[PDB]
Every structure is written in C-alpha cells, then in structure tokens.
Amino acid sequence: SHMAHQDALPRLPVPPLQQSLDYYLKALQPIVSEEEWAHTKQLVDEFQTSGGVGERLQKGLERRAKKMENWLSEWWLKTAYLQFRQPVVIYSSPGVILPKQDFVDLQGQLRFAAKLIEGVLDFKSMIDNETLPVEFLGGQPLCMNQYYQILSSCRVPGPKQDSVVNFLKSKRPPTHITVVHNYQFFELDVYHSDGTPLTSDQIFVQLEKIWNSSLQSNKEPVGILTSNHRNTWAKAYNNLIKDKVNRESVNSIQKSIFTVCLDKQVPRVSDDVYRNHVAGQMLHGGGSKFNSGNRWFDKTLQFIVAEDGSCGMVYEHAAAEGPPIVALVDHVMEYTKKPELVRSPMVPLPMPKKLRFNITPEIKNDIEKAKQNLSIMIQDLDIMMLTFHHFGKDFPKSEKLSPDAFIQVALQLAYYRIYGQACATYESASLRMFHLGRTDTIRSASIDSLAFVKGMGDSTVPEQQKVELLRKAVQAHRAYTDRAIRGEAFDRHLLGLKLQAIEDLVSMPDIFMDTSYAIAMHFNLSTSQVPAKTDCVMFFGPVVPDGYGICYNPMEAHINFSVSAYNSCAETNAARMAHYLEKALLDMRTLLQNHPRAK
Ligand SMILES: CC(C)(COP(=O)(O)OP(=O)(O)OC[C@H]1O[C@@H](n2cnc3c(N)ncnc32)[C@H](O)[C@@H]1OP(=O)(O)O)[C@@H](O)C(=O)NCCC(=O)NCCS
Numbered sequence: 001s002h003m004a005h006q007d008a009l010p011r012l013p014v015p016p017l018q019q020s021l022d023y024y025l026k027a028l029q030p031i032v033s034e035e036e037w038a039h040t041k042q043l044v045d046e047f048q049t050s051g052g053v054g055e056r057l058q059k060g061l062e063r064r065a066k067k068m069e070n071w072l073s074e075w076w077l078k079t080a081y082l083q084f085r086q087p088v089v090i091y092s093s094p095g096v097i098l099p100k101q102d103f104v105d106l107q108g109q110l111r112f113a114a115k116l117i118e119g120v121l122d123f124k125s126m127i128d129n130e131t132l133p134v135e136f137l138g139g140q141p142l143c144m145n146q147y148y149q150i151l152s153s154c155r156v157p158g159p160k161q162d163s164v165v166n167f168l169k170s171k172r173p174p175t176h177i178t179v180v181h182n183y184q185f186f187e188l189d190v191y192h193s194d195g196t197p198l199t200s201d202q203i204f205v206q207l208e209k210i211w212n213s214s215l216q217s218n219k220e221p222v223g224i225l226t227s228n229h230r231n232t233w234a235k236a237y238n239n240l241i242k243d244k245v246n247r248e249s250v251n252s253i254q255k256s257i258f259t260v261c262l263d264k265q266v267p268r269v270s271d272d273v274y275r276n277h278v279a280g281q282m283l284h285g286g287g288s289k290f291n292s293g294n295r296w297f298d299k300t301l302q303f304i305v306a307e308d309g310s311c312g313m314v315y316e317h318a319a320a321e322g323p324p325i326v327a328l329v330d331h332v333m334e335y336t337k338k339p340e341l342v343r344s345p346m347v348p349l350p351m352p353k354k355l356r357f358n359i360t361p362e363i364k365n366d367i368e369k370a371k372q373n374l375s376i377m378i379q380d381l382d383i384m385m386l387t388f389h390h391f392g393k394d395f396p397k398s399e400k401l402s403p404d405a406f407i408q409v410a411l412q413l414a415y416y417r418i419y420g421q422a423c424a425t426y427e428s429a430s431l432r433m434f435h436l437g438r439t440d441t442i443r444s445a446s447i448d449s450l451a452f453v454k455g456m457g458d459s460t461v462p463e464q465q466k467v468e469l470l471r472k473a474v475q476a477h478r479a480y481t482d483r484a485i486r487g488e489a490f491d492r493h494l495l496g497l498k499l500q501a502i503e504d505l506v507s508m509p510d511i512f513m514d515t516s517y518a519i520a521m522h523f524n525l526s527t528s529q530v531p532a533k534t535d536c537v538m539f540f541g542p543v544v545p546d547g548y549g550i551c552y553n554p555m556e557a558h559i560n561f562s563v564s565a566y567n568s569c570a571e572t573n574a575a576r577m578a579h580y581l582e583k584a585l586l587d588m589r590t591l592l593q594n595h596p597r598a599k
C-alpha cells in the first residue's frame, strides 16, 4: 500500500519465550488431562532452560525479525495456504452471502451486476490512487497491504506447492474483468481508451451481449477443475494450458481484475432450508449440475449474482482476511444504492471476447474426475445458517461487556452443554497493526471459560455466583484478545519456533511432538468474527474432521451466524450446535437480566 504509511508501522514482534510458554500451559489446562499437563509442564521447563533448545530457537527468530520485514509472513502464507493441498473449495476459500436484491427479471439481474461492477471499480480507484482511508483497531494504524493483493490476482496450481500472481502493479495493469455465464468465460474491458471507467449503463449493455453469447449450458464446465485437490488440479492445469487457446483463456482469467458469476435458476427448495442452500451456492456452487462449474476458484475475488435475487461471493484466502474483503463489500453495496442521474446515450461498444476452451479426451476425463470429487465434498458438508434476531452487540454493551467475548463465551457454554467438556478453540485475531500482519490465535477455551460453563449448568451454584463467573470469563477473553492483536499471543510464536527448528536442521523438539500440542492444534471449534455495515454473513468449512466452522457478523440488534460441520463425523451436527448456541446466548442474557448491577 501507500509506502509512507507502511513504513511508519511497527514490525511484527517476537514475544518472550517464557511468556508464551506460560500462556501455552494455561490455555492447555482446560483441554488436556492432568497427566498430560504435568508431562507438558516438564518439557517446557527444559525447553526454556539457559543454554537449552528453546533459547537457541528463540534467538533464531529474533535474527529472522532483523533480516525480514515480517518474520512470520512467508512462513504463514506457505503453511496455512500454499502448502495446504486440500481443495480450496469449502476447506479454504470463505463464502459470503450478501443482502438479497429485489430484481425480478434478467434485465434487473444484469442491472444489479453492472452496478456492482461499477461499485468495485470505484473502490479500486482509491487503491490505484493510494487514497484508501486509514483504519484502526484501537488507536493504532493498520497495515493496508492486503488491499493490494485482492484485485487483479489469482492463485496458481503447483505440483508441490501453489503460488500467487498479482498484476495490479504490472507494466500494463489489466483493465478487464471476467464474466462467467453457463460455464462460459468472457473477457470484458471496464475501462475506455482515455482511461475512464465504463458506466453502469455501459457495463449493462455489455453484460447483455455476454448473456446472449452463452444462452445454453452446452460447453464443458472447465472451471470445475479448480475445485479439485491441489495436487490433482496442478497436473490437470498443466495439461489444460498446453493448448494455445486454452492457455490464452486461462491467462485472461488470472489477470482479470475480478470475476463476476451470473448464476442460473436452481430447483426451488423448502423455505426452511433456503438460506442454507444459498450459502452452499456461494461456498461451492451447489454441484456440477447447478453453478459449481460457473466459477474459477483460483480467482481471488468472485462476485456471484443469482437469478432469484440472491447474491454473494467467494474469495481465495491466500490473499487476505475477511475485514479487507468486507470493507470492499460495504463500499460496493452502498454504491449499488446510489441514485441515478444523467442517463445520456452511449456510443457502440466492442463485443466481449469469448474465452474459448478446446476440450480433449484427457481434459474431459479431468473434468469428470473433478465432478465426482466435488460431489463427495458437497454431500459431506453440513451447513446451518442462524439469524440471531433476539439481540446483538446492544445487550452485551449495556452490560459493559465485550460483544465478541460474550459470543465466544456463549459458544463455549453451548459446546460444553453438548459434549460435557471443553475443546481446543480457535478465533481469528487481526495482527494488522504490524507491517504485513495477518493473524494470530485467540484461544476461547480457558480456565475462566471452563469455570463458567461448569458453574452455569451446576444446579447447586447460586445464580448470582454464575454472573461473576460469566463476567470473569468475558474479561479473560477480552484480555487475551488485547494481547493477541498486540502480537502477545503464543500460537504463531510456537509455530515459528517449530519452523525455526526445521530450518536449523535440528531434531524436532519433543514439545512439538507432545500429545498436548496435538490436541491444542486440533481445533474442534474454528471461528472468526467478520463485522460489516452490510447485513451479510461469511462461512467456511471446519478445519478438522470432527469439528465445526463458525463465523458471525455481530450487528447492533442481531447477529448473523453460520455453522458448518462434516457428515462423516456422527458426533457433530450443525443444526444442533446452532440451536445450543442460540440458547446459550439467551440464557446468558437471562442470567444477567435477573441480577442487575446498578442498585
Ligand atoms: C478480536 C476482534 C474481533 C475484537 O474486536 P472488537 O471490536 O474489540 O469486538 P468487541 O465485541 O470487543 O467490540 C465491539 C463493540 O462493543 C464495544 N465494547 C467492547 N467492550 C465493551 C464494554 N466492556 N462495554 C461496552 N461496550 C464495549 C466496542 O467499543 C465496539 O463498539 P462499536 O459497536 O461502537 O464498534 C478484533 O480485535 C479482530 O481481531 N478482528 C479481526 C478478526 C478477523 O481477522 N476476522 C476475519 C478472519 S478471516
């Protein structure tokens, strides 16, 4: 981003060794047996003794911070995404459901799409001009690098690890987006010769041509290849681009500013599961029989516009976190609401280039293999969307409690009520106050959270006593949060020590092969908060076979929740988890209301 800004920002720190190990042991107590804790406790003491293993690894990290702009950046990008071989669909790329639009006919659908494209191009203006406003997370300026990674970029399949291409700052920045309709991709320029952006009306006229140039779904859904295992896609990709035409088409897709998906009508479903289906549409496409083939999941930004009014998006995670994405959404959405003005006549426009794909028996086979893979993925996904209308940040705030901590504590209560024990819990923490900062881990399962969940369901504990435990759990969570955004958490630090050991060519410390670390890094609950002015909601699949993926947008009067699970694990159920979460939130409000503070 703006160089002047990025330079004034502090570099990612390396927390003290003893400090992090201290927090580690604390966060483990509620999720591991006493026997395992005692053992882990021993490993830690040795690991940090003077002239020991840990001390040496720690020095390595500090040297790393001196030789790099961010000691964690590259390591995190590779281990979290580039080296993650599972399909990006569901397992990595978050999906987003935006507010349903009122268009009723195809003309309105395209009308909205054109407005959306224009809105994005407007946001891009600030990016190219480095005029994008400065953000804060608590009186501290935040890194804006992520904003210069989302547009005109794409992920690229690699035989061993993937890579990412960014053409935003290339010699001749791309001036075209890509539009997908009935599995067919089209290259569309959204800028004039002079360099001015096309207007909503102009873009509309073009979208009309595009739609009529692909009225039927008779072409192979080549885009579905992008939803397969990364290793498999890497080989299919390499073969796919052997053809000049194919290579040319893929190239346009990768360089395009962003992709717009014009989804077709899908089989009407029961109103009680409608939202869950739309969520599926945005996350994976619904299947090879619906809209999954009308996408290119390597593309950083994909905006989806259904024909029934539904709209949303799915983005490739290597590029950024939710905040930057929603900032873009809030701007675009608010832009689509801007009234009209001088609808002067516009001169003829060129015909959008159709990105053809020469299919061969080998490619066809890859496509079919991709369809089968995706079917298995989809069928195994259990999604439940929950709109918590009872209240939002309003209640927790009136109680002088952090809404996010209130929600996280509520989730811990719900989980305990179901399984009778706590579990490793992950919550995304933004480290953007640091140059190139991405995230760290806030662990919601703690000593105080466990003390609360137990006392809460205890029919022998005074209701007033449960209130104290509640506030203490929330405060303990707020504290952890404050430390996390300040680079004082320990998860990324511990990962760094492990990676430092590998690089130092020294044996893997037992502390990392310890059963406790395995449990600690096996997140049965993987979560994140993605606040937005737009009444939208995000979602993603669980990070472990027996876990849940929960995301939420805390609004003032309500909270948009998404809960995912895998059907392969009989012990988990999205609907049930959502129900217990709704009830945990209500029960906590009831407890606090029953015992007011003032007088
Ligand atoms: C962890 C994190 C979500 C906490 O954010 P937060 O804004 O501090 O959340 P809180 O619930 O504490 O605060 C929300 C609101 O309640 C208020 N509040 C907090 N504590 C309060 C209290 N004790 N009493 C009254 N109000 C309080 C805040 O001022 C804020 O006010 P607002 O509604 O006017 O903005 C944030 O630090 C973060 O890391 N966000 C990014 C997460 C991310 O990366 N997500 C995407 C991952 S892909």
Ligand SMILES: C[N+](C)(C)C[C@H](O)CC(=O)O
Pocket (backbone or CB within 6 Å): 321, 426, 427, 428, 429, 439, 440, 526, 527, 528, 540, 543
């Ligand atoms: C979805 N989840 C929590 C697994 C990953 C976050 O989106 C990103 C992060 O916390 O690094």
